[PDB]
Amino acid sequence: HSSGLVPRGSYLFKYIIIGDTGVGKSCLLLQFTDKRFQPIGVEFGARMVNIDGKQIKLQIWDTAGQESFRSITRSYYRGAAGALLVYDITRRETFNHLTSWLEDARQHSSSNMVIMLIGNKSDLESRRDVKREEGEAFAREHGLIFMETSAKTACNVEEAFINTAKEIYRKIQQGLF
Numbered sequence: 016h017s018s019g020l021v022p023r024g025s026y027l028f029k030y031i032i033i034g035d036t037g038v039g040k041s042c043l044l045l046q047f048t049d050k051r052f053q054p055i056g057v058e059f060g061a062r063m064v065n066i067d068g069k070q071i072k073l074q075i076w077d078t079a080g081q082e083s084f085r086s087i088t089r090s091y092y093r094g095a096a097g098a099l100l101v102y103d104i105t106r107r108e109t110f111n112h113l114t115s116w117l118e119d120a121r122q123h124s125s126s127n128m129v130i131m132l133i134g135n136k137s138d139l140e141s142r143r144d145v146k147r148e149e150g151e152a153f154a155r156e157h158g159l160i161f162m163e164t165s166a167k168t169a170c171n172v173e174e175a176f177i178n179t180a181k182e183i184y185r186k187i188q189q190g191l192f
């Protein structure tokens with residue numbers, strides 16, 4: 016995919032969503048863009064958001080399941096303004112792989128990319144395998160924002176995408192982007 020010219024006065028933020036297979040990356044995308052959950056046929060989902068009164072299009076790229084069998088292509092990472100780095104709170108091994116995903120994002124995306132750490136599947140509290148505090152600590156260590164989300168119930172999904180956008184916008188307005 017290649018996005019077109021951005022209309023004057025508006026913004027376009029390319030997002031990526033990375034993490035182990037099955038953590039809910041695709042469901043997060045669709046919950047945000049479509050407000051639906053159905054346990055993706057497209058390279059990306061798009062949605063208009065409003066940040067500081069401005070029109071900002073978020074174009075959220077999906078890995079197309081490639082991480083289940085091969086490396087993620089460099090083209091996927093390129094030009095991203097935002098990344099959700101996702102693990103599944105019910106599976107510790109997905110939390111163990113965060114450092115490796117983060118290192119790849121930092122190797123292949125712009126240094127200015129805003130990364131939010133996401134512990135997904137918060138609705139499965141009885142199956143929790145990673146404590147909230149562990150996610151919080153990882154985020155602090157790596158200078159990331161952190162939320163727990165449920166793509167299923169939509170808990171914190173809007174906030175994850177919008178708060179990431181607010182931060183990108185803040186960096187732009189500060190010339191730090």
Ligand SMILES: Nc1nc2c(ncn2[C@@H]2O[C@H](COP(=O)(O)OP(=O)(O)O)[C@@H](O)[C@H]2O)c(=O)[nH]1
Nearest residue numbers: 036037038039040041042054135136165166167
């Ligand atoms: N209970 C629950 N299940 C989820 C959630 N997010 C995703 N799933 C389920 O997790 C599985 C993997 O989701 P998917 O979006 O394909 O993960 P991806 O491989 O990381 O893109 C599917 O069976 C989803 O229905 C969530 O927040 N809660």
Ligand SMILES: [Mg+2]
Nearest residue numbers: 040041079080
């Ligand atoms: Mg997927």
